Enzyme design. Structure first.
Site, PDB file in Angstrom:
ATOM      1  CG  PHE B  61      -1.698  -1.187   1.489  1.00 60.40           C
ATOM      2  CD1 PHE B  61      -2.139  -1.987   0.450  1.00 60.40           C
ATOM      3  CD2 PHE B  61      -1.995  -1.560   2.797  1.00 60.40           C
ATOM      4  CE1 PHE B  61      -2.863  -3.154   0.706  1.00 60.40           C
ATOM      5  CE2 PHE B  61      -2.721  -2.714   3.059  1.00 60.40           C
ATOM      6  CZ  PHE B  61      -3.155  -3.509   2.016  1.00 60.40           C
ATOM      7  CB  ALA B  63       6.084   4.407  -2.583  1.00 58.59           C
ATOM      8  CG  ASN B  65      12.724   5.635  -1.999  1.00 61.79           C
ATOM      9  OD1 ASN B  65      12.589   4.638  -2.703  1.00 61.79           O
ATOM     10  ND2 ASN B  65      12.155   6.789  -2.279  1.00 61.79           N
ATOM     11  CG  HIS B  72      29.462  17.873   5.974  1.00 59.02           C
ATOM     12  ND1 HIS B  72      29.615  19.201   6.323  1.00 59.02           N
ATOM     13  CD2 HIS B  72      29.528  17.167   7.129  1.00 59.02           C
ATOM     14  CE1 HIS B  72      29.787  19.290   7.633  1.00 59.02           C
ATOM     15  NE2 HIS B  72      29.732  18.072   8.147  1.00 59.02           N
ATOM     16  CG  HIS B  82      32.342  20.484   9.387  1.00 59.51           C
ATOM     17  ND1 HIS B  82      32.702  19.201   9.030  1.00 59.51           N
ATOM     18  CD2 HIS B  82      32.512  21.245   8.280  1.00 59.51           C
ATOM     19  CE1 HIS B  82      33.074  19.189   7.761  1.00 59.51           C
ATOM     20  NE2 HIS B  82      32.957  20.414   7.282  1.00 59.51           N
ATOM     21  CG  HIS B 211      35.227  25.079   6.445  1.00 60.57           C
ATOM     22  ND1 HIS B 211      35.269  25.493   5.132  1.00 60.57           N
ATOM     23  CD2 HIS B 211      34.288  24.101   6.504  1.00 60.57           C
ATOM     24  CE1 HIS B 211      34.408  24.782   4.422  1.00 60.57           C
ATOM     25  NE2 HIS B 211      33.797  23.935   5.231  1.00 60.57           N
TER      26      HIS B 211
END
Ligand SMILES: O=C(O)C(=O)c1ccccc1S
Ligand SMILES: O=C(O)C(=O)c1ccccc1S
Ligand SMILES: [Ca+2]
Ligand SMILES: [Ca+2]
Ligand SMILES: [Ca+2]
Ligand SMILES: [Ca+2]
Ligand SMILES: [Ca+2]
Ligand SMILES: [Ca+2]
Ligand SMILES: [Mn+2]
Ligand SMILES: [Mn+2]
Lengths: 262, 262
Positions: B61, B63, B65, B72, B82, B211
């Site tokens: 019944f 769907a 995944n 990242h 990070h 960063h």
């Protein structure tokens, strides 16, 4: 009274704390409770895994990061209409094709925590929703409706969260007529704090899993494993519940957030 | 009051007088993913999407995944953990950071023309100051994003990374650009490129200053942002919220902006 004033006002009130962002999301990790289906009936979505790539070491000197084994339908998460057979033919029914305007809306928080504590198979009915509206105000087009059960108190223990015994899972949810009624008010979608949008015993309702069936039939959304609904008012909050833009996605883990006064 | 403001905002979201803009690229096998010298570091994996069922004998019944999904990946969020410079913030993970900070006015600095002329284009402090003289000063807690329209390249990973013998060539900020923004106490910095730094940031002082410095200051990074060409320079609200990954260093996100209409 202009849109710009609303947005500038929101920005100022977020900084001052007059508007608070509530985290409506549970922790996403290996201990996150995941749906269990009868093996004869269907394959299960996998348990969450977090794998180290590096953490400031010879595999990545200056940085830390991980990769995941992650089902779409994991933890606090979003159900797109393609998730159910009844929603299969909406071209806009995927996480990457749906209308993002619909994702952020006033939320109606229906507190069923006392009833669910007394009866884990508690069902929210159309009559009870109407009584709620009588007290709090009518549910309107495009709004989120969420069933607060405080089931998130159980999320640290998957067995307790699924709450199954010999006859299956026992967790609260809506009746088919309750969902039918909400859909007549043209809501955007329906949210639960349990493992799914339907009652644990919905496998035996007519139709089976009516929230899934009816919501997605009408190109509407579902939310599962919502946390901290006890921090929201019945009326007045805005819920932000946006799936990752997964290609042809049927659903997605989310960072559900709510805007609340005070 | 706060509640009246949220009611007014809620009505405008429902009516479309405030527009929700999708700032996210599609997340799937074809999503461009960072490539590092393997003698330097292990790579974060390509995105995979795997069918569990689609209304068939595996799940009659429904769907759904499951995914192989790096933190990242695609339009995504960098938490302070990070980078090595953010390693000691206990609140530096996707599950411990302050969600109050995630929604804020955004400053959209258009460098698209400059970037088309020079893929190694660098946004400097002086250029940001010139942008402020025209558009208004950048304020505390705000998002700052560098529009380059690099998202136009996301259909071709090779073009998106844009590497040659001396490495990746994509636009980004100088060290003094990030230092200046941090002095205004911004919440975070976003890029439309694969990461928050210029492709050639490796030879900068310090290397990868976005960063380095952002996360030094317990601030956030956004990468692979899409559709910044649909935002105004000023006045929009950006919502950029990572999944609540347990000790997560970052996360794919559904980046959404609120823009005003009249
Ligand atoms: O994860 C879901 O959407 C969910 O609740 C569900 C998924 C698949 C089958 C049955 C159910 S009841
Ligand atoms: O955080 C990221 O995805 C990122 O931009 C990055 C990650 C690891 C190494 C270098 C970079 S430059
Ligand atoms: Ca629209
Ligand atoms: Ca009973
Ligand atoms: Ca709580
Ligand atoms: Ca292509
Ligand atoms: Ca270089
Ligand atoms: Ca665009
Ligand atoms: Mn689901
Ligand atoms: Mn990153």
């Amino acid at each position: 009274m202009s849109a710009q004033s609303a947005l500038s006002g929101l920005g100022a009130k977020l900084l001052s704390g007059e508007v608070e962002v509530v985290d409506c999301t549970g922790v996403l990790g290996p201990n996150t409770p995941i749906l269990q289906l009868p093996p004869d009936f269907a394959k299960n979505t996998p348990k969450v895994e977090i794998h180290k790539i590096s953490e400031y070491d010879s595999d990545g000197p200056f940085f830390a990061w991980n990769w995941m084994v992650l089902g779409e339908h994991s933890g606090t998460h979003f159900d797109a209409p393609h998730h159910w057979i009844t929603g299969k033919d909406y071209s806009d029914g995927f996480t990457d094709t749906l209308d993002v305007q619909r994702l952020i809306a006033p939320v109606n928080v229906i507190d069923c925590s006392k009833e669910s504590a007394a009866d884990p198979d508690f069902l929210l009915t159309a009559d009870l929703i109407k009584a709620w509206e009588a007290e709090h105000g009518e549910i309107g087009a495009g709004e989120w409706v969420v069933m607060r059960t405080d089931w998130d108190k159980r999320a640290g223990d998957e067995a307790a969260f699924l709450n199954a015994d010999e006859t299956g899972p026992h967790s609260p949810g809506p009746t088919p007529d309750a969902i039918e009624y909400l859909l007549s008010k043209k809501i955007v979608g329906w949210g639960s704090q349990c493992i799914g949008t339907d009652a644990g015993q919905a496998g035996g309702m007519e139709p089976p899993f009516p929230a899934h069936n009816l919501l997605h039939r009408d190109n509407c959304f579902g939310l599962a494993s919502l946390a901290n609904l006890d921090k929201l008012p019945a009326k007045g909050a805005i819920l932000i519940a946006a799936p990752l833009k997964i290609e042809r996605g049927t659903g997605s883990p989310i960072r559900a957030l709510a805007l609340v006064p005070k």
